Amino acid sequence: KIHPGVAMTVVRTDEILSENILFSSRASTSMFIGTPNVSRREARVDAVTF
Amino acid sequence: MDLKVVVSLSSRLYTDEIAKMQQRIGCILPLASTHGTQNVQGLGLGQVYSLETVPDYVSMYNYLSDCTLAVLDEVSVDSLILTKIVPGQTYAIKNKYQPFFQWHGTGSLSVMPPVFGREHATVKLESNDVDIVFPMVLPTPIAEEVLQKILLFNVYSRVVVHMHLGSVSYLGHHYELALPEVPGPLGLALLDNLSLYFCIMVTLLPRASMRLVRGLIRHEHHDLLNLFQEMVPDEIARIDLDDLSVADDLSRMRVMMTYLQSLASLFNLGPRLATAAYSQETLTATCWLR
Amino acid sequence: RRRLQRRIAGLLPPPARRLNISRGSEFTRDVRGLVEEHAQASSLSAAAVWRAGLLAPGEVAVAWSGWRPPVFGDFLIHASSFNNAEATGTPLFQFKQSDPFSGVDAVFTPLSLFILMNHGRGLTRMANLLYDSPATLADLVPDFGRLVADRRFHNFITPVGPLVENIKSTYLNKITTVVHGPVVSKAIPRSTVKVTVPQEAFVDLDAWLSQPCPADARLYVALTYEEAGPRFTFFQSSRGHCQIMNILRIYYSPSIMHRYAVVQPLHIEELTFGAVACLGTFSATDGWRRSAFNYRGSSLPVVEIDSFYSNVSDWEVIL
């Protein structure tokens, strides 16, 4: 427990779970909504996956 | 059945990267998942083949057999679409690969990690800061020649004849391929299993066929016999001193043909494509997964 | 050439791969025409037959879609050689009998396949509880000791896929099994069928290693040759056959040197460390939900692979 001939500066990172607040102004972004088209992916032998 | 995987890029895409990707339309690309939409990470062979100096081809094979396969048909800015290759469907796969291997009529295609360089089959995407590389698709005999040339350079590395091994030769052109130095534990494990197979071959191999070829070299000269240079090997001399017996030979061949099928399946790494009716004027082939 | 347009109108339109829905609440007739698959069983009237469309050639069409109809293997077995308390979805194994004309075949569940390995030397409690006497099974294989001794037991047993129909006859049982295709039960209330493999004989190989998740995770059955008699293990993997023989050699790496150390292979035929065979594919996500199989007395753990596509293959030797 003697001191060595050198020192150290211990850096670490600490994660903090926050509860954010998002503001956004009116008419900031114009967006086009598409069409919800349905499909068939896989005809597995007992269940078909849409 | 609907096979359409749209891959949304998380950023934009410049016109040079668009024009480079648009030349590679119809080339086979692997995917991470099999779902509807995907992000750009996991696409291509680039996640296992990093931008380094050291490759590892057998790990890319273990990736390629694990992941699915898709064909690149539409590329746009911010999103490019792919068409999956599920077994049971029949696809039109165009020959849009720059080292031009001419395809056989109703032969068999075979996907492949990029043996002719990283920079050769790739697109640099600085915009999404990743790299999409394209797996090579070449016919199955030339694929076997490339695979055995890689393994032969892996075993001859502690010996040295280089350019006689480090360059594939096809009737269209002969091509150089990238030669690494060590495949790590996976290529050595493949060589381990093939060493088991080869050593058990030289256990159970018959002796009457050596007695055939020893007199046959002394009898006949052939292109199957010119590589011995009219010198029977000494192992033929020190094995053919015994007699010949047909019962132990039929006992030996019943394990020889039993093991050679599994040795044939020790070269089926990477998924295989069974093709049909390849037209040499449109460079596309009606092909499906085998 | 105007009848040609009528023929091509009868031939053109595939089932819709895409359909623009607006809401799910309306449930239009177009999306019903998308989601409907023609059945396989209907009542015995002209209206029900014409409505289900069984009489359409090749595939069902009322008066191609990526679906393949299954094929059924029809097997006649002795009522003693099989247990009628078996589950439906259990994979069986026809043994090629050595007579020129038989009529009656010989199939084996992996429970029944266990007691051919046990005698001469949990799971075994349930196995001996189901079949009382091994000697009524150990004569179906006439020369079991020689065939195990010269390591030719893999080429005489071929897999057959899971069972679907088992009529409860008294002397000569007829069972139906799906040797290829979508495994689905032939019951008048069409209910699903789960391939059941007992738990101690089914060791996973994905979690045995412990990112690209594929869809079709195959199921490999594996005969190996041990000094304690041969063993029938089952392996689930999401990889290729090229991958599966390498990783199964790595998995059996202690057992090969075990069999070598206790017994020197004095002849040339004892080198083969059995073989493997792909039994078919299933979905890698909801695969292998664990369940239980209850007899009257006891209960063993058993895996339940659901929605299996049976596809057997030839034997690839392990060494």
- Phi and psi of C165, rounded to 5°? -125, 130
Alpha-carbon span B280 to C288, nearest angstrom: 47
Looking at residue C234, the DSSP 8-state letter turns out to be E
For B3, C64, C210, the CA distances from C4, given in Å and listed in that order, are 31, 22, 61
List the structure tokens of C56: 């359409």
Between CA A50 and CA B3 the distance in angstroms is: 12
Minimum distance, in Å, between the CA of residue A26 and any CA atom of chain B: 25
Rounded CA-CA distance C34/C60 in Å is 15
Angle, helices B184-204 vs B246-264, to 10°: value is 160
Asked whether the beta carbons of residue B2 and residue A39 sit closer than 8 angstroms, the reply is yes
- CA separation for the pair C237, C284 (Å, rounded): 9
Please give the single-letter amino acid code of residue A14: D
B29 strand-pairing partners = B70
Question: For residues C3 and C9, what is the distance between their CA atoms, to the nearest angstrom?
Answer: 10
Paired sense of beta strands C157-166 and C91-95, if any? antiparallel
SS3 C191: coil
Query: Which ranges of C12-160 does DSSP label H, i.e. alpha helix?
Result: 29-35, 46-52, 110-118, 123-130, 144-149
Q: Give yes or no for C240 touching B (CB within 8 A).
A: yes
State how far the Cα of B120 lies from the Cα of C8, in Å rounded to an integer.
47
For C247, the token pair is: 């990783």
Determine whether the interchain pair A39/C18 forms a contact, defined as Cβ–Cβ distance below 8 Å: yes
Interface contact flag, A40 B36, Cβ < 8 Å:
no
Residues C117 and C229 sit within 8 Å (Cβ to Cβ): yes
Q: What is the resolution of this structure in A?
A: 4.3
CA gap B45, B61 in Å, rounded: 10
Kind and range of the H or E run holding C161: strand C157-166
b/e sequence C173-197, b meaning 16+ C-beta within 10 Å: bebebbbbbbbbbeeeeeeebbbbb
- Work out the burial of residue B42: count CB atoms within 10 Å of its CB; fewer than 13 is exposed, 13-18 middle, 19 or more buried: middle
In terms of Cα–Cα distance, which of B204, B214, B181, B196 is closest to B256? B204
User: Whole-angstrom Cα distance, residue C301 to residue C303?
Assistant: 7
**Residues C72, C192, C60: CA angle, nearest 5 degrees:** 60
Q: Is any Cβ of chain C less than 8 angstroms from the Cβ of A50?
A: yes
Give the C-alpha separation, B268 to B280, whole Å. Answer: 27
Q: Which of C19, C59, C281, C319 has the most B C-beta neighbours within 10 Å, making it the best mutation to test the interface with B?
A: C319
Minimum distance, in Å, between the CA of residue C68 and any CA atom of chain A = 9
Report how far residue C253's alpha carbon sits from residue C245's, in angstroms, rounded to the nearest whole number.
12
Q: Do B42 and C212 touch (CB under 8 A)?
A: yes
Closest CA to B30 of B8, B10, B7, B50: B7
Tokens linked to C105 = 């075949």
User: Which amino acid is located at B131 in the chain?
Assistant: D
Q: Rounded to 5, what percent of chain C is helix, strand, coil?
A: 25, 30, 45
Q: Residue B69: closest CA among chain C residues belongs to which residue?
A: C214
Q: Which helix (H) or strand (E) holds B250?
A: helix B246-264
Query: Cβ neighbours of residue A36 under 8 Å, at least 6 residues apart?
Result: C20, C21, C22
- What is the C-alpha separation between C118 and C106, in angstroms, rounded? 19
Of C216, C239, C246, Cβ closest to residue B193: C246
Answer yes or no: are the C-beta atoms of A40 and C19 closer than 8 Å. Answer: no
Tokens of C251: 């998995």
Backbone phi, then psi, for A7, in 5-degree steps?
-120, 170
Nearest CA among B97, B141, B139 for reference residue B117: B97
Which residues in A have their CB inside 8 Å of a CB on B? 39-43
For C255-268, give the DSSP string: HHHHHHHHS---SS
Beta carbons of C17 and B2 less than 8 Å apart: yes
Beta bridge partners of B71: B28, B83
CB contact under 8 Å between C308 and A45, yes or no, is yes
Residue C62: strand, helix, or coil: coil
- Among C21, C181, C192, the residue with its CB nearest the CB of A46 is C192
Residue with tokens 């069984």: C54
